[PDB]
Design a protein around this nucleic acid. Structure first.
Ligand code: ZN
Lengths: 104, 52, 131, 154, 194, 134, 343
RNA sequence: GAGACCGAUAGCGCACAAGUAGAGUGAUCGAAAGAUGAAAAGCACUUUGAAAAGAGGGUUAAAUAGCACGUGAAAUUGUUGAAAGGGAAGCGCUUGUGACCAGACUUGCGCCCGGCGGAUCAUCCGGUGUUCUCACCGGUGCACUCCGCCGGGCUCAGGCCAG
RNA sequence: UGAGCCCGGGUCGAACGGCCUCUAGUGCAGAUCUUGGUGGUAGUAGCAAAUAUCUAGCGAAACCACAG
RNA sequence: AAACUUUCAACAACGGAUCUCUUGGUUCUGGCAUCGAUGAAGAACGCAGCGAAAUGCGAUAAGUAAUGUGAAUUGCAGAAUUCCGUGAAUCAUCGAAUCUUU
């Protein structure tokens, strides 16, 4: 997906990417979820322009009634949360192993 | 014909989904898990200069 | 030494199929099992000398479920890349070439599987030996 | 493996067919069953002696109680009848097969009726329904026997 | 975000996933050290990863992926050539994958063992097929098979086999190919011919 | 992709328009490419075929056969080349219907109107060549 | 209706069916009337029937055969080119000097594929050829896999003349590989690979017989192409040249439209029954000399069909070395036309 | 101009002769019915006979695609082969007999000599791409090391069932 | 366990399948169910609208869970 | 013994399901506004070489004129009808005409 800035790049690049099978073009001010997650599957490959990044900084402060959401988790790395000196220090000794030997 | 064909979604939830999709697009394992051939792509948010 | 893994002996609790009640009499009734829903149906009430119904007690051991008599599990393959996925599972899985695979692609799959040490169930398909 | 009984050579057989024939299926089937397995000239004389009235055709499966005479003593069936049109159609197909065997180069004095099959034809849409039939008969030659020669010593 | 991409891969959709009805899922990714979809074997949901792959030349390499090149899909893997000596290659895997998870080390040794065993088996198989000379070829296609069946039926009809044999035997009997006093036929039959 | 709203990408309408076309539209549809030498000579790629052209068949079981077009059967959407015929059961030699897309015109039946067609096509191609050059 | 399809002109199925039925009635009645009138005029004038018969001949694919305008693959007639030269075989005897100074008595070794299951079928095929022994190729399941070249060398060292390999498909015979081992200092010779398609043992044949130990006589019919001459000679060397005529046994390999029908009969020269006709000769009736004499035949051997698929220089593909590795290979595109035969 | 529609018992009653055929004094009621083949190349000719029919023979990639035409289910029917039965058949569990069909572990690795050839061997030389320390080529040679290939030698491991 | 699924053999001739989601005119043994096709009765009753016996030709209907 | 009845397999029938197809339907959307006493909608009778149906047309009758294109129509039969031409066509456009009985 080609994301461009129509103010700084113009709309002539839309014509040159039209016939190439598969490639799509979208302005940075009118991004489409149907194109960013095709089929409901996340992770679309995107070629940006430089002006696309600068106006991508710009247009998320211009939406009225919307601010960029704050996550309920600060550090999403669970291995950093659990395997850290902070938590490992207060942990009681293990009560068993991953595999329990059969007693009788 | 008076079946409900269209779905009203809150604009806040649509902007949340668009921002989540944009954030997911900057992660390369998600790009290959979606099915994109990016093994020769130098950086996942593939920024090219506007002069090109 | 090349065979399947060491596995516990394969025990089938029942080898026959569960036929639908009165399906041998009517040609409009397929033999696929349907649970009887009538109140006085003696198959449903489990009277003596009648059909048994499928129960969870008839289930197979989890260590030998889905396992062929040779000890392998069937793995459906459509191309050569699919048999390559059994490089590390040559003793646990056997290749089952799909029914719509052409002859030359079948030759490619059989050749690669032999090199990988993977058994093919239908290697006597539309191929023949040339001297 | 098991091998099926191979067919006899096409140079030793002669086939005749008749399709969508306007005769009753049951009477034609019984007439064909009566002459099944016989020699060709015997079947010719029987059908010509059932077209003009001397000889009877017994019925076993599609048997209707119509006549009870002595002509069924030779077949062991107490129910005997005389269909006429089925005899004419069987006669026509038998001379057709005779012409086919004469053209092919078979000895017409040693022809036997290997098999004769009467199948049902599509019903004539006119509630009264007609019952046409297909007939497929195959005549063969009598099996030939050759005396062996004594084996040689080595 | 290893856990978040793992949740997205495992619970929603992955293009490298083969779901079988036999109790195991498989990973179609080429860099998977074991072709199984589970948490430890995922090449995508693990930022630090290691696998062992064999080139078409036959040289076997160890591929190592770190988190600091994770935004560089063209620079994800560093490739290290493994020795032809099996024990020295095992020690090379031990030396390069130091301080890695033990699962990755164990699966790398197992994959190297299986690749060397497959190479030896391939050499033995190639020698055996070179000695025997056998080769699998496709059977006749259904159109060609139908063509041969129909034309063989027509050729058998046009052959007139028994008539041809009888005619050629009578022709051999006429021209004296069996000689005077033939052992084939009765003396009266030979008298009638003359 | 089509942009003009008057164009239809319907398979149904396209098939109906193709198989229920008038004779002049069928003439336009039954067109054949020119040979390489004629393409460099007249600067024209393809022309509607006509009786009297000499063609070479480049597709089908009658490949590399040459001959003069003796019939343009627009109803059956086929042309009849000279000596590319068949045999019936009775022995009659019937022509074999070859689509005009399967042949290449090696010699044109040059009249005044055909020269006008060639001139118009050449003028359009050269004016687009001028537009591309500058 | 010989030029027009009613299905492509009438859009209604029922109307087209009614029109076709009426056309069949009219055409059948007119054709029967025309033939009855013609027969009445043949009865009036019995001379123009002969001109009608000699002018209106039925067609045959054999007469429509396409030849070529000689080296192992040219579709030519050797006898007719020979008669052209009398009024351009040498390439065959140059390429195959061992097959083409009489050959010795043949000893045949018959085997199967690797894990062969056709033991009775291969034993019967060996029982076809005089002086033929059948040896299995693997003994048990997990023994040594001998190659065709090794077995050919082993049988060459033991005095065998030729090696026959019967290859199975679905537990039925499918391919026949004939290798000529030659003798003295000559290497093992050409390899001919045929396909067995319609195999039936003697028991399957209704009204059959049991063969004896007499040497049969060969009826190799309709071989004209140099490839066909090579196949006929390869079948000829497998059998002894002198047949024991006391036991009237005939082995027939008849080539028709590239298909070689193999049969085996026993015969007797008997007097004709008075309803039998005299035997018609080829291209003209009344076989001169045997009018009233006919041959009775009884099948004592298997019915099989062969089609030559490959001719190799050595023992198979692995064994043929130089640029003249394969002598001839069958391709389906060579049977693109139904009147083109390779023999 | 289109569709997350229907696909010939569906979708308009009507994909085709459809408000037609046909019914009713009339107002009105109102069907069934699509597919040969790429191309008719729509089966010449010989021979039975009175048929909307056959046998040879031909066209076709194919006619068991022949204007009864793509494929061709079941109900129901005929020919052949096998088995059983004559005061019901059919079903569940368990052996036996006959016929037919399948074919068990895909059946390997490691050491010790001799010869040969390559290299990740040579602190050998030159070049290329790089994540800048890892890969890939080209040329040298076998002192060491490591791989293979060939000829000998030895050990071991091997699937199932009985006692 | 099961609803089911996979492979072999034959026929055939132009499209189709798995997985993750979405969607619905989505699963039949019965409704004196609808439409089509096909039976025993039955070559029987009778020769009747349409098309006093024996023998040719023509030839139904009621009824039918399976049998006495 | 033979005959009959039942089950299974192969082949051959009956029948038209399934699969695949679709110049058809159905639902939505957009531009536009145009029947008739200057005789409408509808009904009937006729016009072609072979016309059964459908369609077109009206005694100028599967049509005439004018314009445009540029070499056919076509199932069979016929044309000395036209191919550097005011010119084929079961062609398209269409401004001029003909237009039976109701
Ligand atoms: Zn995964």
């Amino acid at each position: 997906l080609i994301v461009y800035s129509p103010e700084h790049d113009g709309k002539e690049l839309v014509k040159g990417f039209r016939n190439i099978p598969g490639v799509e073009t979208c302005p940075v001010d009118a991004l489409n979820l149907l194109q960013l997650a095709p089929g409901g599957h996340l992770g679309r490959f995107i070629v940006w322009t430089s002006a696309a990044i600068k106006q991508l900084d710009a247009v998320y402060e211009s939406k009225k009634g919307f601010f960029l959401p704050a996550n309920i988790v600060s550090q999403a790395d669970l291995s950093r949360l659990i395997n850290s000196t902070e938590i490992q220090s207060v942990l009681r000794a293990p009560k068993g192993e991953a595999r329990t030997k059969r007693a009788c | 014909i008076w079946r409900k064909w269209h779905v009203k979604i809150n604009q806040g939830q649509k902007r949340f989904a668009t921002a989540s999709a944009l954030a997911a697009s900057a992660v390369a394992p998600l790009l290959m898990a979606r099915g994109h051939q990016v093994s020769t792509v130098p950086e996942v948010p593939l920024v090219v200069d506007s002069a090109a | 030494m090349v065979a399947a893994k060491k596995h516990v002996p394969i025990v089938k609790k029942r080898t026959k199929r569960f036929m639908r009640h009165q399906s041998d009499r009517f040609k409009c009734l397929d033999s696929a099992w349907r649970k009887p829903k009538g109140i006085d149906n003696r198959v449903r009430r489990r009277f003596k000398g009648n059909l048994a119904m499928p129960s969870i007690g008839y289930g197979s051991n989890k260590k030998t479920k889905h396992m062929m008599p040779s000890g392998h599990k069937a793995f459906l393959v459509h191309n050569v890349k699919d048999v390559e996925l059994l490089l590390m599972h040559n003793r646990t899985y056997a290749a089952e070439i799909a029914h719509n695979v052409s002859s030359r692609k079948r030759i490619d799959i059989i050749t690669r599987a032999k090199q990988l040490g993977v058994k093919v169930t239908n290697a006597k398909a539309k191929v023949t030996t040339e001297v | 493996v098991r091998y099926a009984a191979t067919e006899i050579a096409p140079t030793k057989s002669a086939r005749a067919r008749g399709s969508y024939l306007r005769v009753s299926f049951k009477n034609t089937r019984e007439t064909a069953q009566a002459i099944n397995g016989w020699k060709l000239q015997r079947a010719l004389t029987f059908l010509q002696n059932v077209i003009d009235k001397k000889e009877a055709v017994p019925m076993r499966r599609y048997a209707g109680s119509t006549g009870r005479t002595a002509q069924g003593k030779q077949w062991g069936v107490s129910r005997a009848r005389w269909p006429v049109k089925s005899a004419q159609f069987l006669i026509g197909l038998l001379k057709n097969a005779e012409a086919n065997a004469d053209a092919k180069g078979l000895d017409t004095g040693n022809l036997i009726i290997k098999h004769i099959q009467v199948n049902q034809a599509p019903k004539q849409r006119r509630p009264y329904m007609s019952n046409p039939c297909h007939i497929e008969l195959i005549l063969t030659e009598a099996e030939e026997t050759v005396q062996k020669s004594e084996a040689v010593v080595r | 975000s290893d856990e978040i991409v793992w949740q997205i891969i495992n619970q929603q959709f992955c293009a490298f996933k083969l779901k079988t009805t036999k109790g195991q899922n498989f990973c179609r990714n080429e860099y998977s050290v074991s072709g199984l979809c589970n948490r430890q074997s995922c090449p995508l949901a693990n930022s630090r990863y290691a696998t062992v792959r064999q080139s078409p030349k036959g040289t076997i390499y160890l591929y190592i992926k770190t988190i600091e090149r994770s935004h560089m899909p063209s620079k994800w893997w560093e490739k290290i050539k493994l020795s032809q000596n099996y024990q020295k290659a095992l020690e090379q895997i031990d030396q390069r994958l130091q301080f890695f998870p033990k699962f990755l080390i164990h699966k790398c040794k197992q994959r190297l063992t299986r690749l060397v065993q497959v190479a030896i088996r391939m050499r033995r198989i190639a020698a055996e097929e070179a000695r025997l000379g056998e080769k699998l070829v496709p059977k006749m296609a259904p159109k060609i098979k139908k063509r041969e069946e129909a034309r063989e039926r027509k050729a058998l009809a046009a052959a007139k086999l028994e008539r041809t044999i009888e005619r050629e035997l009578l022709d051999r009997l006429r021209q004296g190919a069996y000689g005077d006093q033939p052992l084939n036929c009765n003396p009266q039959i030979w008298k009638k011919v003359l | 992709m089509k942009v003009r709203p008057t164009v239809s990408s319907s398979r149904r309408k396209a098939r109906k328009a193709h198989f229920s076309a008038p004779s002049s539209v069928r003439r336009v549809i039954m067109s054949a490419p020119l040979s390489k030498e004629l393409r460099e000579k007249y600067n024209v790629r393809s022309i509607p075929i006509r009786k009297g052209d000499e063609v070479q068949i480049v597709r089908g079981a009658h490949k590399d056969k040459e001959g003069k077009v003796t019939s343009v059967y627009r109803l059956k959407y086929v042309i009849h080349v000279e000596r590319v015929t068949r045999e019936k059961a009775t022995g009659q030699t019937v022509p074999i219907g070859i689509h005009p897309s399967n042949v290449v015109i090696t010699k044109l039946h040059l009249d005044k109107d055909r020269e006008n067609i060639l001139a118009r096509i050449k003028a359009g191609r050269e004016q687009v060549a001028k537009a591309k050059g500058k | 209706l010989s030029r027009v399809s009613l299905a492509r002109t009438i859009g209604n199925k029922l109307k087209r069916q009614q029109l076709y039925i009426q056309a069949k009635k009219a055409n059948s009645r007119a054709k029967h009337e025309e033939r009855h009138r013609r027969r009445k005029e043949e009865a009036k004038n019995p001379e123009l029937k002969q001109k009608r018969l000699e002018k209106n001949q039925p067609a045959s694919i054999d007469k429509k055969r396409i030849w070529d305008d000689d080296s192992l693959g040219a579709v030519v007639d050797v006898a007719e080119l020979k008669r052209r030269r009398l009024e351009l075989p040498d390439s065959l005897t140059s390429q195959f000097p061992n097959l083409f100074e009489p050959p010795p008595v043949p000893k045949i070794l018959v085997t199967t594929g690797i894990n062969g299951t056709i033991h009775k079928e291969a034993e019967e095929i060996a029982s076809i050829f005089p002086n033929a022994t059948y040896i299995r190729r693997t003994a048990h399941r997990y023994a040594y896999k001998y190659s065709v070249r090794e077995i050919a060398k082993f049988a060459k060292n033991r005095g065998y003349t030729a090696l026959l390999v019967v290859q199975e498909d679905q537990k039925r015979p499918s391919r026949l590989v004939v290798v000529h081992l030659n003798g003295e200092g000559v290497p093992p010779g050409p390899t001919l690979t045929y396909t067995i398609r319609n195999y039936a043992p003697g028991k399957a044949i209704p009204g059959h017989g049991r063969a004896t130990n007499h040497y049969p006589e060969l009826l190799l019919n309709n071989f004209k192409t140099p490839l066909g001459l090579l196949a006929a000679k390869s079948m000829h060397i497998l059998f002894p040249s002198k047949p024991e005529l006391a036991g009237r046994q005939v082995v027939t390999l008849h080539n028709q439209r590239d298909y070689i029908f193999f049969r085996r009969h026993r015969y007797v020269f008997r007097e004709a029954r008075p309803t039998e006709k005299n035997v018609v000769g080829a291209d003209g009736k009344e076989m001169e000399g045997v009018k009233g004499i006919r041959a009775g035949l009884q099948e004592i051997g298997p019915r099989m069909t062969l089609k030559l698929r490959r001719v190799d220089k050595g023992v198979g593909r692995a064994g043929s070395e130089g640029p003249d590795a394969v002598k001839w290979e069958w391709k389906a595109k060579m049977e693109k036309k139904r009147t083109r035969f390779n023999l």
